[PDB]
Copies of this chain bind each other. A is one copy, B any other.
Amino acid sequence: AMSMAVESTGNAKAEAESRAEAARIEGEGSVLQAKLKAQALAIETEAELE
Protein backbone atom coordinates (compact mmCIF):
# COMPACT_ATOMS: atom_id res chain seq x y z
CA ALA A 1 0.00 0.00 0.00
CA MET A 2 3.02 2.27 0.53
CA SER A 3 4.35 1.65 -2.97
CA MET A 4 0.75 1.97 -4.18
CA ALA A 5 0.82 5.54 -2.84
CA VAL A 6 4.29 6.50 -4.12
CA GLU A 7 3.24 5.29 -7.56
CA SER A 8 -0.28 6.79 -7.65
CA THR A 9 0.51 10.25 -6.29
CA GLY A 10 3.98 10.30 -7.94
CA ASN A 11 2.30 9.87 -11.29
CA ALA A 12 -0.59 12.33 -10.94
CA LYS A 13 2.04 14.73 -9.60
CA ALA A 14 4.35 14.54 -12.61
CA GLU A 15 1.29 15.12 -14.74
CA ALA A 16 0.07 18.09 -12.70
CA GLU A 17 3.44 19.78 -12.24
CA SER A 18 3.76 19.48 -16.00
CA ARG A 19 0.39 21.09 -16.65
CA ALA A 20 1.08 23.82 -14.07
CA GLU A 21 4.64 24.39 -15.37
CA ALA A 22 3.45 24.79 -18.99
CA ALA A 23 0.89 27.35 -17.84
CA ARG A 24 3.60 29.12 -15.84
CA ILE A 25 5.57 29.83 -19.02
CA GLU A 26 2.35 30.45 -21.01
CA GLY A 27 1.29 33.12 -18.50
CA GLU A 28 4.68 34.84 -18.27
CA GLY A 29 4.40 34.84 -22.06
CA SER A 30 0.96 36.46 -22.32
CA VAL A 31 2.31 39.20 -20.03
CA LEU A 32 5.37 39.91 -22.24
CA GLN A 33 3.10 39.39 -25.28
CA ALA A 34 0.20 41.66 -24.28
CA LYS A 35 2.86 44.17 -23.19
CA LEU A 36 4.16 44.15 -26.76
CA LYS A 37 0.68 44.34 -28.33
CA ALA A 38 0.48 47.32 -25.99
CA GLN A 39 3.32 49.45 -27.40
CA ALA A 40 2.45 48.07 -30.83
CA LEU A 41 -1.30 48.75 -31.01
CA ALA A 42 -0.43 52.10 -29.41
CA ILE A 43 2.25 53.30 -31.89
CA GLU A 44 -0.41 52.20 -34.36
CA THR A 45 -3.23 54.02 -32.55
CA GLU A 46 -1.25 57.23 -32.13
CA ALA A 47 -0.11 57.71 -35.74
CA GLU A 48 -3.73 56.72 -36.48
CA LEU A 49 -5.00 59.85 -34.73
CA GLU A 50 -2.52 61.99 -36.65
Specify the main secondary structure of chain A where it touches its partner.
Answer: helix
Q: Evaluate contact between A34 and B25: CB separation under 8 angstroms.
A: no
Query: Which one of A2, A18, A39 has the greatest number of beta carbons of chain B within 10 Å?
Result: A18
> When chains A and B are docked, how far (Å) is the Cα of A16 from the Cα of B8?
9
Chain B residues within an 8 Å CB radius of A11: 1, 4, 18
A43 cross-chain contacts in B, Cβ below 8 A: 31, 34-35, 38
A34 to B18, CA, bound (A): 17
Cβ of A27: which chain B residues have Cβ within 8 Å of it? Answer: 32-33, 36-37, 40
The residue from B20, B41, B50 contacting A28, defined by CB atoms under 8 A apart: B20
Q: Which residue of B lies closest to A32 (CB)?
A: B24
